[PDB]
Amino acid sequence: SEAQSRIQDADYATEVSNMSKAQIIQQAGNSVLAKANQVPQQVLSLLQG
Amino acid sequence: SEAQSRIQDADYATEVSNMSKAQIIQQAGNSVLAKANQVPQQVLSLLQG
Amino acid sequence: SEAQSRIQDADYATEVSNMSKAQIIQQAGNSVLAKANQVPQQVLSLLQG
Amino acid sequence: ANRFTSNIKGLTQAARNANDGISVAQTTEGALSEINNNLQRVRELTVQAT
Amino acid sequence: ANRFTSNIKGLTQAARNANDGISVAQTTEGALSEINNNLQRVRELTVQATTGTNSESDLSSIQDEIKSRLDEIDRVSGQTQFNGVNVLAKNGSMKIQVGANDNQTITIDLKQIDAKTLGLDGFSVKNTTDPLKALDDAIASVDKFRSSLGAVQNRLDSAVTNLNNTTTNL
Amino acid sequence: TGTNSESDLSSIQDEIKSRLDEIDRVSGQTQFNGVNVLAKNGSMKIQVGA
Amino acid sequence: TGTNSESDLSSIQDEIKSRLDEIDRVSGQTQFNGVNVLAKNGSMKIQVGA
Amino acid sequence: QVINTNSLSLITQNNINKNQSALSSSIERLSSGLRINSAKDDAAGQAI
Amino acid sequence: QVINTNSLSLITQNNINKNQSALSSSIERLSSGLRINSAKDDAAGQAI
């Protein structure tokens, strides 16, 4: 049973750290996507004058 | 259920990006239309002298 | 009594998840409605010049 | 997607139905346990009487 | 540009297609997991039954439970269908279009998993020689199919990532 | 794709046949100055000299 | 590793062979503008002058 | 200045899609408590 | 990013439902004091 635990069970500390890092990455990517979609707005300024 | 989600549901990132691009295209087209309608004014200058 | 509970009582995990999802959908719909009402403004620019 | 939704609803309803069968089996098992206790006491009484 | 647009549309459609194969493999793997649990319980039952302490009625009850779980295995095999395809009812294969041109398929394999194709046809513990060996053989034979399904899932995921990158570049 | 059932293939073929019929329609119908340009192999000669 | 049995080695080899086939497929099918770049040693000449 | 293609947005979406898998796997492992939840994970450890 | 389906939540609910049975059985065995509280447990041990 202890061997099966050493094979299949997960370490909660590592999983928590990875999940927190993934959440931070997701929010950062969302913000960067917002900035990227905001970038092309200067063409409207070009056409307007 | 997750298969049905992978089939019918939409990814909001792509939809938001396409919506922003479409809005920019619409505004640019409106500006170019205004310029195109302003083009024919030179005939009035020709007739004026 | 257990048989009645298996029929008439609710499962709180599912209800909470559905509540959260419904609230997210409602706020998303409100934002999309605001943008949809914002869309027709381009005709004002068309008329202005 | 229409077929998938049909399958999802059918499976949910099927699980709901199976819960009823589990309940029926539980009730019958309880009744049988009481009958077993009565039969055991009857056997003890017969042992005393013979 | 015309050829580029054709390639973009084809590759996007191919990624969408690969998602379907991923879903098929996931569903089949879930069904296999349930079958594995039933087989494990049956093995425990046989271990309990092959003892001299048990009387004939006890063996009859154990056989009743074992037969019920075997019928459950057979039912889960037969009834489980995905998109009107009984995956665990006949040896076959699927060809997942993961490319823009023709003959761009990743082959998924499906094995008929049931009592007949596992050696557990007529498995009884009352009035079968070497029951535990046959049960272990069936467990390993479903584990092999599960491993193949997992490998196919990994291949499909890698394909989806590559198609996404290629579509972006083109 | 192998996941598609027969009805799905039927729907896809229906739509494809509709678009092919549309292509044939647009080919046959387009007419410039009483000339069906995309209906017959031919040639036009434009006088660009005196 | 010595702890792995023959069935475990078979499963690992199955996954390895699948990934090698995926590598070969990605190599063969990667085509740009009707050119299979990762399928044959060659060279392209880009005109960067007048 | 192209407004018919937003390549940067495509790159960002690709990175987000790449990230999604790690988050999904981490949450699944935390919920189940088992590192091996499917044959895609190891399946040799799963057979053992 | 899908907000119409919450697959991860479904997995978590499935795991919780799986766990419920062990807790229920353990509490029943602790309260009653007998390992075989019903026929679904063993029923061979129960007949004996």
Curated annotation (Swiss-Prot), chain D:
Transmembrane segments: none annotated. It is found in: Secreted; Bacterial flagellum. Flagellin is the subunit protein which polymerizes to form the filaments of bacterial flagella. Belongs to the bacterial flagellin family. This is Flagellin. It comes from Escherichia coli (strain K12). The gene is fliC. The chain holds residues 51 to 100 of 498 of the full protein.
